[PDB]
Symmetry: C2
Subunit: 282 residues, 2 copies
């Protein structure tokens, strides 16, 4: 489970030597974007989707990625091989770079970090998790910025309350996403519902929506009023690491008996289907 | 104008060796706080006010600063002496630290960086600057976080438009501050007006409000409607580096003839008064 190397700016570097000078704008100014994906069987999953997002994120902050997509793909595969792993987490980071004035981007720094496949990845627990609502709206929500100020600061509140996560509700009226996951409801007629605006367009959310539609579920992408939690039978998260994770309780509302609902469970299987399908093209 | 040393975690380090490992949460997660102040005649200005803010900022993110205030003061003076400077900019940074999981703070990293006194510091130009309104509200506004995503991303828009700065207007209705300055109006009866909520409590703003009140101006701290720009005679910024800076135009509105108004000019002098007064106690 040893990771020997990261990559900074196209060079493989021993993990213990992977450092940035303190003039980096991520350090001074929280200025950067990132992406994160799994590799299984030697292959980053849905890699083209993740790379497209990373490139779009970067354009929205006016940061030039120093390599084209094919070259970045090569550095990622080479990093997998240098670390001798087939199953991994992979973090891409693009900082504002070393700035003259501690404010203006000049030259982004590109990081590629690697981890063991997270131990909890795709656990697919039958017992739903317990989350709280939190009134908040992420800034630049369609961009995967490095800014997790509120998300990280809320850990103490979450934990204090007996929860393990939250769902952000824009002005306490409109359901969005957690700090790190997209959020879905399943209605009693088996319509799946998820927000369409002022959220991060997850890659997992994409694959799950396509898989759902292919299975013959209706998926509405729309604004979601907080009151609509009381109409839902089921609730779940999507994310790279969670896959599809049942939510058993929100605040004082228990969904079902707290265990994974039937459509959520099918969506777990369909998601694994997408993964396999992807890996068949590799 | 050579700066030889920074300080990381209580050790003086040659500037070229001042680095953090990439697992630092400022890099991964934009998680950190900072402060910034000038030194003149060998003395950080209003140091106790800046330190109190840095300590309050840190508590709001649940980050423990590794030294008490007296010890931090000592490292700052020692850094001034190691660099052999009397006139400086000083940046304190407190990151989330090196985190196990790329998310949870464990041990903050403390940086102290130093610069030449900025060349533009307290320029006190007679010609006001030109700024645009921008609809936006900073998150965690009373905390001096490292997150300048919107501020930095707006540089291109600002510059594209012939402006050099912006003023954030919460939901386009309530005037707040720029990314880096507090904002004041002077009304035709010479009432000074500045926002009281959902802004950073600047140290400059403090000294200028106290100086104004001591001079016999009324200073209202209150919500400010956007329409109130049309009642104002004068507008200015306060910040560590600007001191008091005249704003000559906002969007299509010219204040006066574009040059510094009379109360703004007096406030510049009074601010310099506060600086001198401070330096007399050193
Ligand atoms: C805010 C936010 N929402 C959701 C996700 C989930 O994205 P994905 O399924 O691509 O991991 C991420 C990442 C995120 O940063
Ligand atoms: C958002 C914001 N407002 C205003 C200021 C001005 O603070 P000061 O006068 O302490 O430099 C700063 C710093 C800032 O980050």
């Amino acid at each position: 489970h040893m990771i020997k190397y990261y990559n900074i700016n196209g060079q493989q570097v021993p993990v213990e030597n992977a450092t940035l000078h303190v003039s980096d704008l991520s350090i001074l100014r929280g200025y950067g974007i990132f992406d994160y994906f799994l590799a299984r069987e030697g292959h980053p999953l849905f890699l083209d989707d993740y790379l497209n997002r990373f490139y779009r994120s970067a354009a929205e902050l006016y940061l030039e990625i120093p390599f084209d997509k094919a070259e970045l793909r090569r550095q990622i595969y080479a990093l997998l091989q240098a670390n001798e792993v087939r199953e991994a987490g992979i973090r891409l980071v693009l900082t504002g770079g070393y700035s003259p004035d501690g404010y203006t981007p000049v030259n982004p720094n590109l990081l590629i970090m690697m981890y063991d496949l997270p131990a909890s990845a795709w656990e697919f627990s039958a017992q739903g998790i317990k989350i709280i609502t939190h009134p908040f709206q992420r800034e630049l929500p369609e961009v995967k910025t490095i800014n997790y100020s509120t998300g990280i600061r809320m850990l103490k509140t979450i934990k204090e309350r007996g929860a393990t996560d939250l769902i952000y509700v824009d002005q306490g009226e409109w359901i969005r996403e957690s700090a790190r996951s997209n959020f879905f409801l399943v209605m009693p007629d088996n319509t799946i519902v998820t927000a369409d605006e002022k959220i991060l367009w997850g890659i997992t959310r994409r694959q799950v929506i396509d898989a759902a539609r292919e299975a013959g579920y209706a998926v509405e992408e729309r604004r979601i009023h907080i009151t609509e939690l009381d109409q839902a039978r089921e609730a779940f998260f999507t994310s790279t690491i969670k896959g599809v994770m049942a939510i058993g309780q929100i605040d004082d509302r228990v969904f079902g008996d707290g265990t994974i609902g039937k459509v959520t469970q099918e969506l777990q299987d369909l998601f694994v289907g997408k993964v396999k399908a992807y890996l068949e093209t590799c």
